[PDB]
Amino acid sequence: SNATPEEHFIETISLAGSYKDWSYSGQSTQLGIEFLKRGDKSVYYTSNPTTFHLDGEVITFDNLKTLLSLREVRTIKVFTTVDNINLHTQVVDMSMTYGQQFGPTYLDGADVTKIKPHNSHEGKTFYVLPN
Ligand SMILES: [Cl-]
Ligand SMILES: [Cl-]
Numbered sequence: 001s002n003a004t005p006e007e008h009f010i011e012t013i014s015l016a017g018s019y020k021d022w023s024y025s026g027q028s029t030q031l032g033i034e035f036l037k038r039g040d041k042s043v044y045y046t047s048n049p050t051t052f053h054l055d056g057e058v059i060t061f062d063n064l065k066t067l068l069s070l071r072e073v074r075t076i077k078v079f080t081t082v083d084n085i086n087l088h089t090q091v092v093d094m095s096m097t098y099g100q101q102f103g104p105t106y107l108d109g110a111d112v113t114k115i116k117p118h119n120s121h122e123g124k125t126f127y128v129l130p131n
Contacts, residue, residue: 002051004088005061006050006052006061007050009055009061009065010045010050011037013035014026014041016110019036019067019068020068021038021072022036022037022038022068023036023037023038024035024036025036025042029044031044031053031111032045032046032047032051032053033045033047035052036068038072039086041054041055043059043064043068045061052064053059054067056063060073065116066125071095073093073094074094074095075091075092075094076091076092076117076118076119076121077089077090077091077092077120077122077123078092078117078122078124078125078126079088079123079125079126080102080125080126080127080128081122081125081126081127081128082127082128082130084125084127087125089095089125092117092121094116094117094118095116095118096116097114097115097116098112098113098115098117099112099113099114102126102128102129103128103129103130104128104129105122105127106126106127107121107125107126107127108126108129112126
């Protein structure tokens with residue numbers, strides 16, 4: 001029987017080994033076939049009928065393609081300080097500026113309010129206003 005667009009998408013990805021920055025798995029689990037993985041996220045599919053699942057929710061095929069192409073939300077860890085005495089280990093969303101997450105932010109005196117976090121910032125100390 002001729003592949004549906006959903007089945008064709010799965011089969012093509014299973015042969016190529018990935019879809020953009022998602023890795024093909026193919027592992028059979030209680031949640032269905034582990035289809036695509038990116039960081040801590042796994043898309044599954046069940047059969048009869050072909051149904052996609054992410055984070056305990058059924059997602060349609062059109063909505064899956066949108067979600068797969070969204071930029072991955074990545075994080076780094078930094079220290080924040082209000083005083084250069086007391087440092088707090090803080091997770092940073094790499095999709096947002098320092099300013100969006102912390103308010104006005106300096107790194108060794110340089111204003112990084114408008115800057116996006118980068119890997120090279122991991123473990124650095126940022127000076128912020130008190131909350
Ligand atoms: Cl799930
Ligand atoms: Cl930037």
